């Protein structure tokens, strides 16, 4: 198996064991610490930040009896979100998203989820997580997070992820509003570049959100034995939230496409303006060049040598030529 | 494909019906109960003035103008037995034309 990710900077493992009576968290940089949790009855969350170390992920997978195809999908990043159902586990593939202003680019972090017995396994490509709120929920005993099994932990991870999809959507909304104002006010090169970049980002966001909707539909409809009957409505709610996200993405995509083609309409008039400029200067200054080049010959006998006041006469002729060429324009408002 | 059910909206409490359009200026209820021999007209604002028309033995045409008032939509739907998802469809104007058959 090979790892095809851009980030290789850091590796760090956080485990969080939570139960009704008490919870335990223990950050570490080793591997054998998380191994005994395969026999733990209480729910436990294994968060392996740093997927570059293929040795540790291979060891963890071997200790958990998982198929090597799951390993080669976990190390692979450039794939759409997908869900796998198996007799002893369920495999979830999800993508995070980061947005920054002053430079409109989307960063997608591939995160994979493995759920088996009373543990959840996740694999972050890079440091930087979505799941803080569930962390303070488990640590400070908020809600019903600590009264349930690992299926509820899977639900918590997934709906935290869709919540930050909502945050991404609001950032994109502000950008689309300002870009609409900019295009309707004054379009130039950077406005068109921003519009194209926004269209590309919306393409990526759509191609990510739709498979996630399919994943959630499978989760709450296939009702696998690993997920209890009580946990279905929560996944159903997450599915509805994904529907909201997809509808907003489609609306934003249509808006951006309209912004693009309204600008792309007006190329030909700019062509006319530029070519009219070219034509007016060329038509003014080629006859002038001919006039100023004919008298430039170095012939032994030259008629204007005998002529008197040659400069005023020639420059007057050239100036009136320029004037008559200029007034030849403006007939249909060339200038 | 799936049994009908109210959807979950992230920014709203669970049992919320929201008018999705943008018109909030007009509200009136107009009825034209008619039969072979006699017909009657009256516009009104009280919603209880039109509910006893559910059990009319002759055709009646209740015309509610202004659905920003989710009060009247919800009350009429609850009195006439309309399912909450149908009320959600009525209030959602970002929609395509469709027909649904109930019992």
């Amino acid at each position: 198996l090979v790892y095809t990710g851009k980030y290789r900077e850091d590796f760090e493992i956080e485990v969080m064991n939570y139960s009704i009576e008490e919870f335990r968290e223990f950050k570490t940089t080793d591997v054998e610490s998380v191994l005994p949790f395969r026999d733990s009855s209480t729910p436990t969350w294994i968060n392996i930040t740093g997927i570059h170390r293929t040795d540790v992920v291979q060891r963890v997978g071997e200790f958990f009896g998982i198929h090597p195809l799951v390993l080669e999908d976990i190390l692979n990043v450039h794939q759409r979100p997908k869900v796998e159902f198996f007799e002893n586990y369920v495999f979830i593939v999800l993508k995070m998203f980061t947005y920054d202003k002053n430079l409109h680019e989307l960063e997608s972090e591939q995160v994979s989820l493995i759920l088996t017995k009373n543990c959840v396994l996740m694999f972050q490509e890079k440091i930087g997580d979505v799941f803080d709120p569930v962390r303070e929920r488990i640590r400070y005993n908020r809600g019903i997070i600590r009264k349930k099994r690992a299926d509820y932990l899977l639900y918590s991870l997934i709906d935290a992820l869709v919540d930050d999809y909502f945050v991404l959507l609001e950032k994109i909304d502000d950008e689309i509003d300002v870009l609409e104002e900019e295009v309707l006010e004054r379009p130039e090169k950077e406005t068109v570049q921003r519009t194209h970049q926004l269209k590309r980002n919306l393409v990526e966001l759509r191609k990510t959100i739709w498979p996630l909707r399919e994943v959630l539909s499978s989760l709450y409809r296939d009702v696998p034995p690993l997920i209890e009957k009580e946990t279905v409505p929560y996944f159903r709610d997450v599915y509805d939230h994904t529907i909201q996200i997809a509808d907003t993405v489609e609306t934003f995509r249509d808006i951006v496409s309209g912004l693009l083609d309204v600008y792309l309409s007006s190329v030909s008039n700019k062509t006319n303006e530029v070519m009219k400029v070219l034509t007016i200067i060329a038509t003014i200054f080629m006859p002038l060049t001919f006039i100023a080049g004919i008298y430039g010959m170095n012939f032994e006998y030259m008629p204007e040598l005998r002529w008197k006041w040659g400069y005023p006469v020639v420059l007057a002729v050239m100036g009136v030529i320029a004037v008559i060429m200029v007034v030849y324009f403006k007939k249909k408002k060339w200038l | 494909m799936e049994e009908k059910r109210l959807s979950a909206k992230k920014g709203l409490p669970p049992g919320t019906l929201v008018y999705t359009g943008k018109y909030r200026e007009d509200f009136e209820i107009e009825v034209m109960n008619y039969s072979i021999e006699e017909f009657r007209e009256f516009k009104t604002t009280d919603v209880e003035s039109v509910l006893p028309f559910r059990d009319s033995s002759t055709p009646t045409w209740i015309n509610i103008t202004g659905i920003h008032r989710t009060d009247v939509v919800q009350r009429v739907g609850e009195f006439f037995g309309i399912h909450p998802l149908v009320l959600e469809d009525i209030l959602n104007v970002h929609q395509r034309p469709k027909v649904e058959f109930f019992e």
Epitope: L169, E170 | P13, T16
Partner: antibody
């Protein structure tokens, strides 16, 4: 026709408890969300808490959360706000407001306070 | 807590002239911004919701606009019945917040 009337405001010893009543008229509380917004003298408006009587969903301001509790009953068609462990900064004109939800995009909804009470000083 | 910053704190204007206020959001509020007016010793009245939608029964001189996280309330021409404090409210989150107000005094 539609109007909100609030009551239950007055003097109280700091550290004590108080309750405010909001009476509805011309509308049904079960179909709307009721907010309390206070305004201390010399300062501006400050949202405190809200409730949706249909489901019981409730939110409190961070500076208010923990001690206040807002409730309502469709039978009496009134909204209540329990003010526990009052402090010197909680003195203000307390308002009752009805709001509706409007639509922006499929992911974002708004909230506008169209009808207001009259204010009860505490 | 999403803080709405509203400027100017106090404004003086002449009747019949154009007056504008600005409310700046600290966070990304989508479009859920409402403007209210409050004459002293009175309850607030809704003027504009959704940052550009005018409440029914409000004069057309009141207008709202949005440019990203910048929301502006404008009155085309002031009137004697138009001097009060104006508030901007965000309702993107369940913990809705107000501004600090903006007074309009006759000049």
């Amino acid at each position: 026709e539609v109007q909100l009337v609030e009551s239950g405001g007055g003097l109280v010893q700091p550290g004590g408890s108080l309750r405010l009543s909001c009476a509805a008229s011309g509308f049904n509380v079960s179909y709307y969300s009721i907010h309390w917004v206070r305004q201390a003298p010399g300062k501006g408006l400050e949202w405190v808490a809200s409730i949706s009587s249909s489901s019981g969903s409730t939110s409190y301001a961070d500076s208010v959360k923990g001690r206040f509790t807002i409730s309502a009953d469709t039978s009496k068609n009134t909204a209540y706000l329990q003010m526990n462990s009052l402090r010197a900064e909680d003195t203000a004109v307390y308002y009752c407001a009805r709001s509706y939800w409007y639509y922006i995009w499929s992911y974002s909804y708004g909230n506008a306070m169209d009808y207001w009470g009259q204010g009860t000083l505490v | 807590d999403i803080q709405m910053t509203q400027s100017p704190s106090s404004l003086s204007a002449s009747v019949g002239d154009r007056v504008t206020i600005t409310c700046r959001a600290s966070q990304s509020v989508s479009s859920a911004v409402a403007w209210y007016q409050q004459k002293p010793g009175k309850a607030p009245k809704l003027l504009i919701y959704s940052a550009s939608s005018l409440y029914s029964g409000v004069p057309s001189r009141f207008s709202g606009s949005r440019s990203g996280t910048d929301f502006t309330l404008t009155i085309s021409s002031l009137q004697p019945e138009d001097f009060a404090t104006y508030y901007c409210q965000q309702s993107s989150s369940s913990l809705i917040t107000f501004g600090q107000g903006t007074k309009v005094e006759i000049k």
